[PDB]
Write a protein that binds this ligand. Structure first.
Ligand code: NCA
Ligand code: NCA
Lengths: 484, 482
């Protein structure tokens, strides 16, 4: 098998930095901070992902690929890469040798509880070396950790933006939040940039919702967050057709739909994409004609449109003159099947029929759909939203301004602050995050004495020290912390 | 733990339900991978890259190690557990998983253009189908993961090439050769990639066009899947470089810090020093200027790395500034101190003992603008190395080049049929050399397709567990640039 050395998962210049530090550098202490927000109406992030990164890479990857292997092997892989990529005849690997001899990562990582709302410009995590000789290790890990933990948090925040909307309109139209868990459904896996990013993003999505088509995300929560699908609802989905299946089955859409709902899935949920040729014809002449069969099933038939303006398809096009197009999918389905009326006067479809829209959904479009459904007396729970790769893939580390910055060093016993301040266009010292009334706040410019003085109010907790994981959060606990 | 993600569950959930929804007697499903549109200006072709890595890693390595070599009962149970407790089925059917395991290999056929080829928008570049009728369902099942894994390596490879394109033309125009270009596009993006795997795929795409990179895992990726060997070829290269935290740790007497770095820590070779920790222009005026003799005595090159301000103005100058150094820009000021040479085209190139690199807020547009404005001042484009970061490589979707996996062809009870929605590609597809361009041919039945096979530039890459094409990084670089 091909091994990527655990000592070279970084930018190239991280390798060179060790010899550049001042003589007698004994400690380097770095923080992980979302420094700004580039999503409207989002001023906090949902901290998530540190545990998965620590378990997969700092514990498992370093043990299996570095510490349990012979010293000569890891030394040689490192030296080979350095020699042939940095043009060094005899690279120094004595620090690698010494780390391997130590047998564990002399590292202290602290972090806020995953599931916590962290304000912009407030640090969520810190890392430091626990043995002076390995000061260089802190800087070394900055790249990989950044590379790994901005995506799960980012997705976690974006998903929550949906949940917050879906909760509120639910409370506004129904009076309870029972349907919201399934109202946000992850459709994004094919549009994520890699399977690993698929796992991290979908795992973020699953903090707020249980509906997903991203199987590896459910299994990710099993792998790193102590979930078990046999004992708790981690994630769930329903049988659903796709355009190629509908096309293969042919244009006698009544026969195809009837076979799908009475023979292939006579009970339970089933989602049928209905726009392969003529969506409104399927609604008018197929779904209507199958009304008795749909009502006779012990389950739900979910109608899935996949083209047009999602807002206008779901809520209606006011300027369209065909009655079905002007009414919209939800109103036409109510006209066919009816349903129930909430205590606040909003219509909920008969539970034998339902709708889902999983193309071109955005946070703004989700809010608009809920608002326009309420404007005509339909409850928000009548639509399931399919959230795609536009939400979960199309971000950067800068979408929430994440950066890992060294804020504190100890050099020959002297405590020192680190910060840049370019004239061509910040955190200092040890940091702490304290609960001040309603919100969390950053305290910086702290020496070791002042940092210890504040230890009882700091909400960052010991997560990983010298190879030992000290905090092991479950998915249920994180969901509890997020949604109370 | 040794947690195993089942090889049969790397997909969208509804892929699992599609098998029973196909018509009776479905014997073949055939799908294509096409970039349908371009959302990047001046780009109407993509660099085909990624298929070999996905095929080796997942279709060969992953499936053999985690599915075919394991006990049949174990894979069956791992499938049933997930389906039962996530699709709320009491007794899931796994007889097809059992049949696949008994078969012992993936009964699929994948064709793809050679990696490194330029594929125009709306031209397919990969197809997949099943080779045994019973396993018609395999094609559809594999669509998610394949799409998950191959849009990013191509996108990066395409975006990287755009930089190369600009850097090539300007080199040809201001130097007369492209020798310096390989190191002019330098990948800085790893910390901003969404995952280590995405880091690897994107950096490999970048390394198709450039040799300069700070993303070590990308170099090693080309070793793992594209037969590269850093002992015998230059896959990726980088140089010693400082960062802001180290500059702060060394203190504000930047004369002594720089002197130590360039005469003691790295007395020879390349060394990149980021110089804007407190005052970039002061560093240029009083540190680099005072160190000119020391810099010129080195058998090597000191590279100056600014990291803040308008990149175009820092590198090429700010015409409206009153300070002479700010007005001139870094390249001209360095020229004033160190001098240099004139190329065959009449453009100035810095003395090889000094250099410049800029790796913050670089875009394709800014790289072109920097080259253009440097040329307008008489300075060759090779005076600047461009650090390309995550804004280029990460801030994309599969929709940036409109990638889609579309079933286009099926065989049901021996009847050939075309698959397409009209709420497009129909039938079997081929890509042929049509004068000077590549053209899509579709609406082909099997007979016409076989007739055209010798002209199709799509080639057999994977069949029934057999790797049929094994391209090297050097071959792909040769196809792309030559
Ligand atoms: N289940 C679905 O309808 C689905 C899933 C993923 C992507 N698109 C649609
Ligand atoms: N070598 C560098 O200066 C560098 C690399 C990656 C990211 N940022 C800076």
């Amino acid at each position: 098998k091909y091994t990527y050395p655990a000592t070279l998962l970084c930018d190239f210049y991280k390798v060179s930095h060790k010899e550049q530090y001042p003589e007698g550098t004994e400690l380097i202490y770095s923080t992980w901070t979302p420094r700004t927000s580039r999503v409207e109406d989002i001023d906090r992030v949902v901290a998530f992902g540190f545990q998965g990164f620590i378990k997969k890479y700092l514990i498992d990857y370093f043990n299996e690929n570095f510490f349990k292997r012979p010293k000569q092997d890891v030394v040689n892989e490192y030296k080979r890469v350095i020699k042939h990529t940095l043009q060094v005849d005899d690279p120094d690997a004595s620090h690698i040798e010494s780390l391997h001899e130590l047998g564990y990562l002399p590292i202290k990582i602290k972090a806020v509880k995953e599931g916590t709302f962290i304000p912009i410009k407030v640090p969520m995590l810190t890392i430091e070396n626990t043995i002076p000789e390995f000061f260089w290790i802190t800087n070394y890990l900055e790249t990989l950790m950044s590379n790994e933990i901005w995506q799960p948090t980012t997705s976690a925040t974006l998903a929550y933006e949906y949940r917050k909307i879906l909760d509120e309109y639910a409370m506004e139209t129904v009076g309870n939040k029972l349907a919201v868990d399934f109202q946000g459904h992850d459709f994004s896996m094919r549009g994520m940039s890699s399977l690993e990013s698929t796992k991290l993003s979908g795992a973020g999505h699953l903090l707020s919702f249980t509906g997903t088509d991203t199987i590896p995300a459910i299994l990710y929560h099993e792998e790193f967050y102590n979930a078990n699908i046999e004992n708790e609802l981690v994630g769930s989905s329903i049988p659903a057709t796709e355009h190629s299946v509908m096309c293969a089955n042919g244009q006698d859409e009544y026969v195809v739909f009837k076979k799908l709902i009475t023979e292939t899935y006579p009970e339970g949920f089933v989602s049928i994409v209905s726009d392969t040729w003529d969506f409104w014809n399927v609604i008018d002449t197929v779904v209507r004609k199958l009304k008795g069969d749909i009502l006779k099933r012990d389950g739900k038939v979910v109608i899935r449109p996949d083209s047009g303006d999602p807002v206008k398809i779901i809520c209606g096009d006011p300027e369209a003159k065909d009655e079905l197009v002007r009414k919209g999918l939800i109103e036409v389905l109510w006209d066919i099947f009816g349903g129930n009326v909430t205590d606040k006067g909003y219509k909920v479809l008969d539970p034998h029929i339902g709708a889902i829209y999983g193309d071109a959904i955005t946070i703004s479009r989700c809010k608009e759909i809920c608002k326009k459904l309420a404007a005509k007396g339909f409850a928000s729970v009548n639509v399931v939203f399919g959230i795609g790769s536009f939400t979960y893939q199309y971000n950067t580390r800068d979408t929430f301004g994440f950066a890992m910055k060294a804020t504190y060093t100890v050099v020959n016993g002297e405590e020192r602050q680190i910060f840049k301040n370019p004239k061509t266009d910040s955190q200092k010292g040890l940091v702490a995050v304290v609960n001040n009334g309603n919100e969390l706040s950053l305290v910086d410019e702290l020496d070791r004495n002042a940092y210890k003085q504040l230890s009882n109010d700091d909400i960052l907790e010991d997560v990983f020290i010298n190879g030992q994981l000290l905090r092991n959060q479950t998915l249920s606990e994180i969901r509890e912390l997020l949604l109370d």
